[PDB]
Design an enzyme around this catalytic site. Structure first.
Site, PDB file in Angstrom:
ATOM      1  N   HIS A  18      -2.000   0.371  -6.126  1.00 60.13           N
ATOM      2  CA  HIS A  18      -2.593   1.120  -7.285  1.00 60.13           C
ATOM      3  C   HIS A  18      -2.735   0.236  -8.522  1.00 60.13           C
ATOM      4  O   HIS A  18      -3.514   0.615  -9.418  1.00 60.13           O
ATOM      5  CB  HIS A  18      -1.791   2.344  -7.691  1.00 60.13           C
ATOM      6  CG  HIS A  18      -1.729   3.406  -6.651  1.00 60.13           C
ATOM      7  ND1 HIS A  18      -2.862   3.912  -6.036  1.00 60.13           N
ATOM      8  CD2 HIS A  18      -0.686   4.075  -6.128  1.00 60.13           C
ATOM      9  CE1 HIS A  18      -2.507   4.839  -5.168  1.00 60.13           C
ATOM     10  NE2 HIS A  18      -1.190   4.968  -5.206  1.00 60.13           N
ATOM     11  N   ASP A  40       4.374   7.621   3.316  1.00 55.30           N
ATOM     12  CA  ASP A  40       4.376   8.929   2.628  1.00 55.30           C
ATOM     13  C   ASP A  40       3.460   9.961   3.332  1.00 55.30           C
ATOM     14  O   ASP A  40       3.430  11.103   2.832  1.00 55.30           O
ATOM     15  CB  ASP A  40       4.073   8.808   1.150  1.00 55.30           C
ATOM     16  CG  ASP A  40       2.986   7.833   0.727  1.00 55.30           C
ATOM     17  OD1 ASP A  40       2.311   7.242   1.588  1.00 55.30           O
ATOM     18  OD2 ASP A  40       2.833   7.703  -0.502  1.00 55.30           O
TER      19      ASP A  40
HETATM   20 ZN    ZN Z   1       1.444   6.786  -1.553  1.00 58.15          ZN
END
Ligand code: ZN
Ligand code: 4WB
Ligand code: CL
Ligand code: K
Ligand code: K
Ligand code: K
Length: 409
Positions: free
Chosen positions: A142, A277
């Site tokens: 990110h 995740d």
């Molecule tokens: Zn993630």
């Protein structure tokens, strides 16, 4: 050939020094060690720089000097009792060094460690010391040029891919299996046809980071997918998926896409972000993937397919907020990589072996996650993606069977 894995004493300490990921990296590497996998793996030491200037040059290949300066200063500020000045609060806010990306005493050293690990991993592939290198301390997809995002401070992935494409025409295929869209990597290479990005993720209103889905613009026209620009047109691929998807449906959603990208792009290197995740047991509770190896873990399905290409591959970590289940998944990914690359079958006991972190694997102390799976827009996504790949191929003057590729779907 050889499978490498990034570890070291300092590296482990730095990777375990963040408030969000705590000792995750330690559980992962200690579970790999408890299963006797370390002797099957080539130790890849994190890269070190001969001076501060050499370190700054490497990180500012992607990041802006002012962002690197602010991250360095945030570390200095958090190693002192002095509260920040009003102007320091503003500077740190301007780089989103707050909220989800707060300061802590090791924030620079922690973030740079992931870079050191992923750069060393790319180097081990480029010089053919390893066919595959794993870095469970990296995958911070990110982070952007001048912004921290989604507890990602420095984009180890962008810098490793930059080292790969800069070597000796080299094409890289990036595959992002994290629950979240691989926005920072996709953006870094938005204008390049030489790095093709593919992210599968959850996308829904208000879900971080909001991208990797239909473009929301002011007209009543049908929404479409942005997919790169200039020479990079059609080179950014995205598959957003609704919550609740299981191993088999996620495997069927991505498998044809992976097959097609490999056949058409013919990459020199593959870089996989394997954020854990998507597991059913992740506290996000969005996807229902498993680490089962008998219904096959979607993660193990994707890694087995990628490794079947026999292209030098970097496997990275990323998200995964259930530390023991993240370790369970990544141990199985590590064993599978030994099996496919060395051609050496690995028998993993279904019971967690005794080791320092054994108590963390309750209440069942088994390798399978403690989850019982139970009881298209995807076909539409497949047609769109197939058309995007034909567009990418035509634009970049690549020859391919196309009937063979249409058949995979
Ligand atoms: Zn993630
Ligand atoms: C600093 N800032 C500059 C602009 C951004 C992000 C970082 C960027 C940085 C580098 C290259 C391209 C792009 N943009 C264009 C896009 C790239 C990926 C997009 C997408 O929706 N993919 O799914 S949009 C981003 C963008 C522009 C406008 C809205 C949104 Cl949500 C995102
Ligand atoms: Cl270690
Ligand atoms: K170890
Ligand atoms: K993803
Ligand atoms: K691209």
């Amino acid at each position: 050939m050889s499978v490498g894995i990034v570890y070291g004493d300092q590296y482990r300490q730095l990777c375990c020094s963040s408030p969000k990921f705590g000792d995750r990296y330690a559980l992962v590497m200690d579970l790999i060690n408890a299963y006797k996998l370390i002797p099957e793996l080539s130790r890849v030491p994190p890269l070190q720089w001969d001076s501060p200037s050499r370190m700054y040059e490497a990180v500012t290949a992607f990041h802006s000097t002012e962002y690197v300066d602010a991250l360095k200063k945030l570390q200095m500020l958090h190693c002192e009792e002095k509260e920040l000045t009003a102007d320091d609060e503003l500077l740190m806010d301007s780089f989103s060094l707050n909220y989800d990306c707060p300061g802590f005493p090791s924030v620079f050293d922690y973030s740079l460690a992931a870079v050191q690990g992923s750069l060393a991993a790319a180097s081990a592939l480029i010089c053919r010391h390893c066919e595959v290198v794993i870095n469970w301390g990296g995958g911070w997809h990110h982070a952007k040029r001048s912004e921290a995002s989604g507890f990602c401070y420095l984009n180890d992935i962008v810098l490793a891919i930059h080292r790969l494409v800069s070597s000796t025409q080299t094409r890289v295929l990036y595959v992002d299996l994290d629950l979240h869209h691989g926005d920072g990597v996709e953006e870094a290479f938005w204008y390049s046809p030489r790095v093709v990005t593919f992210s599968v993720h959850h996308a829904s209103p208000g879900f971080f980071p909001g991208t990797g889905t239909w473009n929301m613009v002011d007209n009543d026209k049908l929404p479409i997918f942005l997919n790169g620009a200039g020479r990079g047109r059609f080179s950014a691929f995205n598959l957003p998926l609704e919550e609740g998807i299981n191993d088999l449906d996620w495997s069927n959603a991505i498998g044809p896409i992976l097959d097609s990208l490999n056949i058409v792009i013919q990459p020199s290197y593959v870089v996989v972000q394997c954020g854990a995740d998507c597991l059913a047991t992740d506290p996000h509770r969005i996807f229902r993937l498993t680490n089962f190896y008998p219904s096959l873990s979607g993660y193990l399905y994707a890694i087995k397919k990628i490794l079947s290409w026999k292209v030098p591959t970097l496997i990275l970590g990323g998200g995964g907020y259930n530390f023991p289940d993240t370790a369970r998944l990544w141990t199985r990914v590590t064993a599978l990589t030994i099996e496919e690359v060395k051609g050496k079958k690995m028998t993993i006991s279904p019971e967690i072996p005794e080791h320092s972190y054994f108590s963390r694997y309750g209440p069942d102390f088994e390798l399978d996650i403690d989850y019982f799976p139970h009881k298209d827009s995807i076909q539409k996504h497949h047609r769109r993606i197939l058309e995007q790949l034909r567009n990418y191929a035509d634009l970049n003057k690549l020859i391919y069977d196309y009937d063979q590729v249409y058949q995979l779907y």
